[PDB]
Amino acid sequence: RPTFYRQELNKTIWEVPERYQNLSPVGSYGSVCAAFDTKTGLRVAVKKLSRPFQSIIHAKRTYRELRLLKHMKHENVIGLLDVFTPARSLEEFNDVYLVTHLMGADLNNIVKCQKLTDDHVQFLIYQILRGLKYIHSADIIHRDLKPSNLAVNEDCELKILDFGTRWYRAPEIMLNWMHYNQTVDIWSVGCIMAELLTGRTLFPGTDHIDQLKLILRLVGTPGAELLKKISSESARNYIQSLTFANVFIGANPLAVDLLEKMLVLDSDKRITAAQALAHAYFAQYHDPDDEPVADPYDQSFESRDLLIDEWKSLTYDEVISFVPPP
Ligand SMILES: COc1ccc(OC)c(CCC(=O)Nc2cc(-c3[nH]c(SC)nc3-c3ccc(F)cc3)ccn2)c1
Ligand SMILES: CCCCCCCCO[C@@H]1O[C@H](CO)[C@@H](O)[C@H](O)[C@H]1O
Ligand SMILES: CCCCCCCCO[C@@H]1O[C@H](CO)[C@@H](O)[C@H](O)[C@H]1O
Ligand SMILES: CCCCCCCCO[C@@H]1O[C@H](CO)[C@@H](O)[C@H](O)[C@H]1O
């Protein structure tokens, strides 16, 4: 057990291993500080969870977040550098701290409402796709992918985050459809990509209905095959009452082709992440031997209704069993 020290930050007492120095608040689920990790030489973000075991819902959430972070081992997806508790036993366990690489720019910061060059767009979207292939292979769907959930460093390395607008959500998410396909996230990539190419938001809806109307105006009324998949006659009648190489003028035709395959209303006909990686638009970056898939992810916990003390114990087990990455 390393030796811990104490310090007052964000209105509570933080207690961290000595390896972590120069804590400085940076945001506030709880609270985040920047630090320097003297063991590794990395700038890190240390998150101290707020009220992790206050209720059944908080406890399950805490367990979910830890299980997710511990599973994610991939260059383009946020990973866990460390997890700790000052507690010496389960009975003493009340606090969880999570550590990852410090991130200081998201994709909005990278763009600044400027068209990126085509080569740049290829490299960014290639990385998002490469991440999404990995996440989707573990049977995980992000469901709210957007620029603020995409960290980019100074060498233009991108990571998918699950933290920091409805503009990039899939339309079926916006309709509380359920039964989501992993291609919900592909919708979102098409929205991001469009914006990188043009410098403008693709579907800047003012409200929920406005957004849906903008979407229908771009990609058109559902076709016959999609209309068969909607049981409600009223939904159909309403949709019909509401109803690329032109909108993306000047762009690389391979970018337009890809956009057309991602921004498809019918989720069952959207390109998958793995098929998108093999699209010609990415020939300069594509490597089929370096687009890894995840180990299987045991999500049996998600359907469980457990008591607080069991969610806390499971979490404690995951804290103890953590092995830092290479
Ligand atoms: C240092 O100078 C800056 C310049 C610009 C800037 O804006 C992006 C910021 C904000 C930096 C920031 O908040 N970085 C950060 C946050 C986190 C973070 N944020 C959240 S909100 C729920 N959670 C985490 C986090 C931290 C550790 C962990 F294991 C998991 C998630 C992770 C990594 N980096 C800082
Ligand atoms: C690091 C990027 C990975 C994507 C993180 C999102 C996957 C979250 O996982 C999910 O949390 C939701 C919250 O109630 C539930 O709706 C989903 O059932 C659960 O699966
Ligand atoms: C502007 C859009 C009008 C509303 C469109 C809602 C149509 C989708 O509604 C959905 O249809 C599915 C297929 O029948 C059902 O399984 C889903 O429960 C329902 O959410
Ligand atoms: C904007 C109003 C029309 C939106 C139509 C969205 C259609 C989304 O696509 C649908 O997604 C479901 C998974 O969620 C699948 O079960 C359906 O088979 C697929 O047709």
Side-chain angles (χ1 to χ4, degrees), residues 21-111 113-153 155-165 167-305:
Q21 290 298 337
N22 302 118
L23 288 179
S24 170
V26 78
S28 48
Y29 64 86
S31 208
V32 185
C33 292
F36 189 71
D37 180 12
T38 60
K39 175 157 184 155
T40 59
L42 276 8
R43 296 183 199 184
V44 300
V46 181
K47 178 162 59 173
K48 174 173 179 190
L49 288 188
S50 169
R51 308 169 186 299
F53 312 111
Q54 168 153 311
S55 62
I56 290 173
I57 309 293
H58 279 229
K60 187 173 178 165
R61 214 157 263 185
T62 297
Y63 180 70
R64 177 179 300 114
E65 179 179 20
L66 183 54
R67 278 298 304 285
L68 252 167
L69 286 164
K70 279 187 65 179
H71 201 68
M72 293 294 92
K73 291 183 183 181
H74 180 95
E75 292 140 47
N76 307 112
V77 179
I78 185 61
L80 192 66
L81 288 179
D82 200 12
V83 48
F84 65 86
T85 180
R88 299 190 176 253
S89 69
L90 176 59
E91 300 60 51
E92 218 171 79
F93 182 51
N94 308 280
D95 281 319
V96 180
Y97 301 81
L98 301 176
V99 190
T100 191
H101 298 96
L102 181 63
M103 344 239 62
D106 65 23
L107 191 61
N108 299 126
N109 307 353
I110 300 310
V111 178
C113 317
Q114 217 59 38
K115 291 182 180 155
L116 306 195
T117 65
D118 192 61
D119 287 327
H120 202 196
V121 175
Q122 295 168 32
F123 182 51
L124 291 175
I125 301 307
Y126 174 73
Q127 291 183 79
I128 297 167
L129 285 170
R130 188 175 174 266
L132 286 172
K133 188 187 168 185
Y134 172 93
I135 294 163
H136 287 169
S137 70
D139 206 16
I140 297 167
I141 307 171
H142 175 125
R143 305 175 169 83
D144 196 25
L145 222 218
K146 63 192 121 189
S148 64
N149 284 176
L150 299 167
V152 185
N153 72 194
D155 292 328
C156 205
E157 301 168 328
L158 180 145
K159 288 177 160 286
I160 302 171
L161 315 176
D162 63 340
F163 56 79
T165 289
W167 296 345
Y168 309 83
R169 293 177 180 168
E172 60 269 36
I173 288 282
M174 298 218 286
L175 290 169
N176 186 48
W177 202 291
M178 317 304 307
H179 289 113
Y180 300 118
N181 284 140
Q182 291 168 169
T183 56
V184 298
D185 291 336
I186 299 295
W187 182 267
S188 295
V189 174
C191 297
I192 293 164
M193 175 165 170
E195 179 171 343
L196 302 181
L197 287 164
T198 60
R200 42 225 332 288
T201 312
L202 182 61
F203 305 120
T206 53
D207 60 34
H208 208 258
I209 191 62
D210 189 47
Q211 184 154 320
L212 290 162
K213 281 161 150 173
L214 293 188
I215 288 170
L216 286 162
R217 289 172 60 182
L218 176 69
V219 310
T221 205
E225 172 179 62
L226 184 51
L227 288 168
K228 286 184 187 187
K229 299 173 160 171
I230 307 178
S231 51
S232 168
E233 270 285 295
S234 61
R236 269 137 50 212
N237 293 329
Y238 186 27
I239 291 169
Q240 302 187 170
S241 89
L242 299 161
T243 67
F244 270 48
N246 172 285
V247 179
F248 303 107
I249 291 300
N252 180 343
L254 289 178
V256 181
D257 184 71
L258 181 66
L259 283 167
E260 284 175 352
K261 290 166 164 157
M262 289 177 170
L263 294 168
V264 182
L265 234 42
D266 188 345
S267 76
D268 303 319
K269 307 301 213 286
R270 287 181 201 146
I271 199 161
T272 66
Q275 295 159 352
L277 284 173
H279 189 288
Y281 189 56
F282 305 110
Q284 60 181 139
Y285 301 105
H286 184 222
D287 179 356
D289 302 319
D290 192 19
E291 293 168 354
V293 295
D295 298 334
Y297 183 38
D298 172 3
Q299 280 179 96
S300 63
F301 80 90
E302 284 291 358
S303 59
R304 264 56 247 149
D305 296 307

